Symmetry: C3
Subunit: 114 residues, 3 copies
């Protein structure tokens, strides 16, 4: 799985180990080994939510399976919780797009997962 967070908060706002926290929490949440989890955080972005340049974030979670209505709500609660606590971004200013990828459409190590 891979989780990407794009945000306008400054780099200094991202605590050391934040990437590791995301990795471990997502492993726990998705059930997949942390070793398969990739995380990417992009601060100091030029973005707005509702026209407002106050702190916000646009994210995406891609995963082969383990993506569904109820599961996504749980992921959102977890992820929004982390962003609020660690980056001080209000949950109502956070979007996370979820993607349930077919194993044939995810490349890794010279091949796919199909």
């Amino acid at each position: 799985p891979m989780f990407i967070v794009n945000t306008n908060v400054p780099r200094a706002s991202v605590p050391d180990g934040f990437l590791s926290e995301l990795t471990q929490q997502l492993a726990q949440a998705t059930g997949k080994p942390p070793q398969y989890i990739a995380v990417h955080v992009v601060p100091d972005q030029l973005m707005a939510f509702g026209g407002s340049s106050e702190p916000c974030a646009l994210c995406s979670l891609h995963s082969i399976g383990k993506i569904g209505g109820a599961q996504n709500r749980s992921y959102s609660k977890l992820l929004c919780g982390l962003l609020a606590e660690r980056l001080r971004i209000s949950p109502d200013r956070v979007y996370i797009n979820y993607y349930d990828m077919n194993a044939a459409n995810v490349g890794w190590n010279n091949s796919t997962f199909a």
Copy 2:
């Protein structure tokens, strides 16, 4: 909805009112409330279009509904126009991927829109 623009033009070439104009124009075109439109512009990127590096842009518009044949054609004309007018990016060096998101796959405020 959410609109992202990745471009190689210098940050100083991006008008300060661009995120606001994109927000207003997208509200106007999609019919979606502006308070829920998120916009993100990422300048100074290392990109190529057709193998060359003159100004170009790769974008994506994610929306729960309001995505389709005719709508996408109108958005493309609207957005290419704005990119040409404000960033001097030729329409022929712009790609816009449209995504009709299921509400269940859009996280926000500790939940989803479904």
Copy 3:
């Protein structure tokens, strides 16, 4: 078609001409005209893969057609190869999400490909 590479490797480590290179190779691989191929490389990113911060990359290949079971296995072999050789990123630390786009959902030059 468009190919995007996000990596934590330094900008200085991205070889000169790498984008034009990718354009040519993707042209042959997909069979599409170079004029329609867009490439985007994002170095110096804050990311982790498997909880490790060693060189890694998260990539996307979007195309109208030319996406499938064996085609994606072949693209993976090729792209992981070029990344390994040119950016020195190990293939076990690279993910590539493949997207088969409907022509109606791809905007370009004030219109769509529908």
